[PDB]
Amino acid sequence: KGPKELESINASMKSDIENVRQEVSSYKEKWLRDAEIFGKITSIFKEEL
Amino acid sequence: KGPKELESINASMKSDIENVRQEVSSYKEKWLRDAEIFGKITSIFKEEL
């Protein structure tokens, strides 16, 4: 492949790696807040079960 | 159908209608159990509010 072509794909792939880290962290945090509220409600009902 | 035959089934058909009334009572009991389940569902509903 042309080195200019290789440089362009390498640069893109780097940027894609970056967007991914941020997206994963945000998804994990939102999921965790929702999960904590869900778990408190799940606790009293779980004791009832 | 023979009237004797009809009289015999109507004894049994009336019995089946009584069984259906008993089943309706059972469904009401099931609804009451569902309502107890709904009262435990009530703590979850308070968390949701």
């Binding site: 999921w31 869900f38 778990g39 606790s43 009902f45 079960l49 | 609804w31 569902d34 389940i37 709904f38």
Partner: peptide
């Protein structure tokens, strides 16, 4: 009877939710 089955399903939904809480404790690690 279908309504009673749905109540049973909501209870089992609660069990699923408890399993989900255990799983969340697990993506916590």
């Amino acid at each position: 009877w279908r309504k009673e089955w749905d109540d049973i399903e909501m209870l089992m939904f609660g069990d699923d939710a408890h399993s989900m809480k255990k799983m969340i404790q697990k993506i916590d690690s």
